[PDB]
Amino acid sequence: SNKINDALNQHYKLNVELGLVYAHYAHVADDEFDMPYLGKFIQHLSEDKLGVHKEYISDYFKRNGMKLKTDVSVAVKSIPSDAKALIQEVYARENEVRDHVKAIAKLALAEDDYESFYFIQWYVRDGLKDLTEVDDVVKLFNSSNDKLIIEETIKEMVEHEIWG
Amino acid sequence: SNKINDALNQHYKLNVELGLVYAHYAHVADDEFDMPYLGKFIQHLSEDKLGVHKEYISDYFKRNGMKLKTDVSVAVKSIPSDAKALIQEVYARENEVRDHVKAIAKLALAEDDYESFYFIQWYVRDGLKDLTEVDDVVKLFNSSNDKLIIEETIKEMVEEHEIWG
Amino acid sequence: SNKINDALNQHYKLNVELGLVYAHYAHVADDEFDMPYLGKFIQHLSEDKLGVHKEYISDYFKRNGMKLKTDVSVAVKSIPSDAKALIQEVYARENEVRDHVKAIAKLALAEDDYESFYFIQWYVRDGLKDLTEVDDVVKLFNSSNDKLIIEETIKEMVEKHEIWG
Amino acid sequence: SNKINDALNQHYKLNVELGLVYAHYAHVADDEFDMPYLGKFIQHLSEDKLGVHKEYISDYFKRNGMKLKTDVSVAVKSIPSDAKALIQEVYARENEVRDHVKAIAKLALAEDDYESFYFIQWYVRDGLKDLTEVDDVVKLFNSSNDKLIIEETIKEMVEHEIWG
């Protein structure tokens, strides 16, 4: 169907934009806020969003017969005042890509299509995994106030049977 | 220096846009014209532009003290009708990137700023290397008109010189 | 979601109660019927119930932001007479667990909450797995009338699929 | 739960019949059109259809409580005229198998039998996997004409994370 194709192309575009903006965030975090390991963490998020997250969609298109568009336009206008607000912006972006995927899954079931449902299961799982990771990183900036302790913990972080 | 920073920001943006365009071309050539290994080759080029070619610039800006800006935008509305035309398209893109980086190198040598000359030497080398890598594949479509033989050749190709390595 | 949280609290308490009952049944079957291996089998089932089947629910709660409630109460006041009635009672308990899981799955699907659907698929599979594991032993008693042969069979069972496993 | 019982019996019968027809097709493709590796390919397809595809159904029947019925009748009288039409015929057969299994899955959801849905996910995936494996072979016959080149390619032709 064409509804499914539109939804998948929108998710493609969203993933590309997220990857680019995350890369910029990682750079500004490492360089301006004196936190290299936060930079590595957000860089890994950005490389994940520009890697398999869209290669899988392109592969599915080549496989079943849909066609692919390309329209991305991003520009960074502001950068949060501290590390905490930045990590919270990241948390919000992920929290919304979750609901985007939920909408796509409902649409899939309502269209008598089941290959698309079996396919979108992967994103249903990865969304929650990534959210719990970024939240476990968010929950540090309240348990402490020293910067180097948080950085050491993130260092030892950057090195399940259902949600795994 | 402001001119150096502006040229390097333009180069960063250019690499990003080329990477996106190459990935889309790879999908097209693998789905529309039935040549999977050409698709894998162009996809490798795409993973190369979106990879070290911008990480190095970001790291340099971290080191020397320059500022980064990100503003990209692309749209792929017209795509060639064959495989030969597609590979010649990407050939032209590489040939233009060569001239862009030569301009940056001249600008760096004029400003009496030698760390940037040292930095840009790597791009001076990699440009010619990638240009020959893609021209070697362009030369195939003038040898045979059989698709599967060209497929076998590019296949064995996807599977280093001292100076231009 | 609130009703999903109620259903999952229900299932948590159900699993805890079943685990305690199964531990008692294993002790009884070992000490009163002189069948130590039937005891080992039921005890493995009990350690399965009090183990993974509730830590998974706890982890899901800690991951999506729901609230866990704990209120259990159990008292085994009557046991069956022989081994066959015991194993048939165990069969009935498992068979009711199946129905409870189906209820939860339907409820989750009817209100557009798909993470819980993906979560509950595991329980959907494990239900039938455990049920056939139990019925394999249930069928043994109708195939003989001696006890020690059943002992040897259960032993070679406990000393041991792409879809259901 | 007899509706799903009947549907699964339909699928069992269809599987064995396709297996036999493919065995005959492989013999024909080897002996008549001088292509032994196309023979190997269709032979592996038939070994797949008569292999796990029906043992899984028998096992689900043994586990849940349904009953099995064997009822087969096959006759191969008219065969395609050349290799391309043969591989295209196989393509269409598997294309129809996909529609059949999708109908089974919709019926399974419509009856609140979630074990059946969980069971049929496997076929829903393997259908598209086999379909793309056969499409990859049928697309070779338009890329050249020398039968020996195509023989070499199919020779060198004999796993993903989602469709794996």
Place this chain on the structure above:
Amino acid sequence: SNKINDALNQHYKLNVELGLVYAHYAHVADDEFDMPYLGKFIQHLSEDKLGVHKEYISDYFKRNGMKLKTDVSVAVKSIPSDAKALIQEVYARENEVRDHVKAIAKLALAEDDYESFYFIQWYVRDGLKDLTEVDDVVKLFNSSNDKLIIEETIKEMVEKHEIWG
């Protein structure tokens, strides 16, 4: 030599039909008589019949120059009432396959076609081998009474000659 051609086509048909029938019998034996290992044994017979027993005929046809024909008509509608009757049905089918292959061999030798004789010697041996393999398990249902001993013995048979090898 259309005689040997029609005989081998008949044998192909019969092999496929007994393959399917053995599959169905293995199912009904595992599910209704509560004897899993007897089901494994009959399933191994089923998988043998549809296996090399017909690929050898099709391969000889390719290598020689005869024509192949497929036609199957199977319908299972009546099932024996216990395990003994089932294994005796299997016994009768094997005993008939022996007679069929003997007829084929005599026809081949009377036709002055010695390649068919050389080919059919394999089936001449394997028929007696498989008949002995089935008779060994037939003889079990007259030596004991409880199903579990028979299960253990069939299991040890299925987990494990210079002439009839």
Place this chain on the structure above:
Amino acid sequence: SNKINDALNQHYKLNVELGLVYAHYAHVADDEFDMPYLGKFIQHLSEDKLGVHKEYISDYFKRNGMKLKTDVSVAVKSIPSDAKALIQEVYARENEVRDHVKAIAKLALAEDDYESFYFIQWYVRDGLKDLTEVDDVVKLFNSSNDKLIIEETIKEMVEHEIWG
């Protein structure tokens, strides 16, 4: 004997109830107080009581021929304010388990039941080990205020000839 049977049934019931309560406390510590490693500590604590601590009793009952009774009543409706009060509550629980075991040992020695004395020696020895392992953690919340320091210390604590 009879009094020994009654005391041992009491102890079995107590150990089961402690297991369940400690499980709940571990969950609430990890989720609400943002301390996952304390959660794992208390989780191993719980799984200890629902492990050997009751299987040993049931085994001894099978071995000398006493009668086992199960009856459990557990409902948690009050929870401490933060981690310190939590671990202090745990400390009180273990401290009470000690003197329950002492009462059992005295009763066993009075009635000239020496097999029960030899049995309860294990429970007598493995009360001071548990109490000192809990005290090592409860006296960490006196030295520091930066929750991540205590987190790392407990982490390294997770991963004797007489008492051991």
